[PDB]
Amino acid sequence: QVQLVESGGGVVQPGRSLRLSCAASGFTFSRYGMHWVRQAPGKGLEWVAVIWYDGTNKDYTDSVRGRFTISRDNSKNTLYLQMNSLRAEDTAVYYCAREDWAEAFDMWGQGTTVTVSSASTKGPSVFPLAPSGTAALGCLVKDYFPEPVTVSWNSGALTSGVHTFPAVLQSSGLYSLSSVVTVPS
């Protein structure tokens, strides 16, 4: 499979670190320049760093200079991003991308999620949203950290009419989301 596969994302406190890896398969990794690109929640794409096929000509977006280091191991077909002194604004999905001869990003990984937050791990409380010719009911999944939670209905046999909403980040630093389904009264 011609593929890039990121790993090493996670959840750390501000000032801590994370090491991202990108495993390349299906092509001659040693011939390609490679990049990191990131996308903060609900935001657009931002270029992060570049490294040439031979490890030279490294460069970084200004906000990560002196904190992130890009490197590669051609014998392991792997690209790395060492992310030190993390800041809240580094929270994002991180993608590795292959640079082609046209200097376009012709292949992207699935991305790995990074959350930088002072919060500590907390399971949610789950509360019912009880019904009052169509009825609506659901569940309120409140006060958890970090993302994600998954929500299913009737162990998966109920899918039609389900809406599982994007989580909101509360001022407490904890997340909350709701899942609802409409059914016949």
């Binding site: 990049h35 690109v37 657009g44 794409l45 931002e46 270029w47 570049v50 460069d59 977006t61 993608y95 082609d100 046209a102 200097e103 376009a104 990003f105 012709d106 992207w108 990984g109 699935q110 991305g111 409380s125 509360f127 019912p128 949203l129 009880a130 009052s132 169509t134 609506a136 659901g138 309120l140 409140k142 809406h163 909403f165 994007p166 989580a167 909101v168 509360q170 909350s176 989301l177 709701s178 609802v180 409409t182």
Partner: protein
């Protein structure tokens, strides 16, 4: 520091009709070698970006005939013939003449006729009330277009700053949105008032719709 300006930010397209979107750069992307170092990407919902157009006008591998890129210098255009459901997502331009920068994205969505929201209100559960907090939830289901307004009222007093909301992505089958709004109160404050209401404003409604309950009924 080349700044890429995309427009519009959002583009509802009736299925079958053409789409056109703009990317303008703050300096020429035309290299001395004759190429414009400008690429277009599509990020479909929940997916990774994928290359559509490279060097201004060249279709990447596997890209349908109906996508075309044009322009030179600072003014570029991506055109889609016969927009279909599979084309929805955020379209991003990118320049690689200098330090790589992206446009802020154009979100393409399916245009349909107006559908009013179906509104539901949910009181806090007894289990949550035990804990000291009351969350009141308002659901606005399967509406179009996306723009909607929720106003919380507590004994007819307009609430401000104590609610959050989120919206689903456009549903691929019926092209509608849904919205959830949560009002959060102390149990102490919750038990000082009687009528909880969410008033919904939307284009499909000739005047705002209110759903409400009486605490304790």
């Amino acid at each position: 520091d080349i700044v890429m300006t995309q427009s519009p930010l959002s583009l509802p397209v009736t299925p079958g009709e053409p789409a056109s979107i703009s990317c303008r750069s703050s300096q020429s992307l035309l290299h001395s070698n004759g190429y414009n170092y400008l690429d277009w990407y599509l990020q479909k919902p929940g997916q990774s970006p994928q290359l559509l157009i490279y060097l201004g006008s060249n279709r990447a591998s596997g890209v349908p005939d109906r996508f075309s890129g044009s322009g030179s210098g600072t003014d570029f255009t991506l055109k889609i013939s016969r927009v279909e459901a599979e084309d929805v997502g955020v379209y991003y331009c990118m320049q690689a003449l200098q330090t790589i920068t992206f446009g802020q994205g154009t979100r393409l969505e399916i245009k349909r006729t107006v559908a009013a929201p179906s509104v539901f209100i949910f009181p806090p559960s007894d289990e949550q009330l035990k804990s000291g907090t009351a969350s009141v939830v308002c659901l606005l289901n399967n509406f179009y277009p996306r723009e909607a307004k929720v106003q919380w009222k507590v004994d007819n007093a307009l609430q401000s700053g104590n609610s959050q909301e989120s919206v689903t992505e456009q549903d691929s089958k019926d092209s509608t949105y849904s919205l959830s709004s949560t009002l959060t109160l102390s149990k102490a404050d919750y038990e000082k008032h009687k009528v909880y209401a969410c008033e919904v404003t939307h284009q499909g409604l000739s005047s705002p719709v209110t759903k409400s309950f009486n605490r304790g009924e």
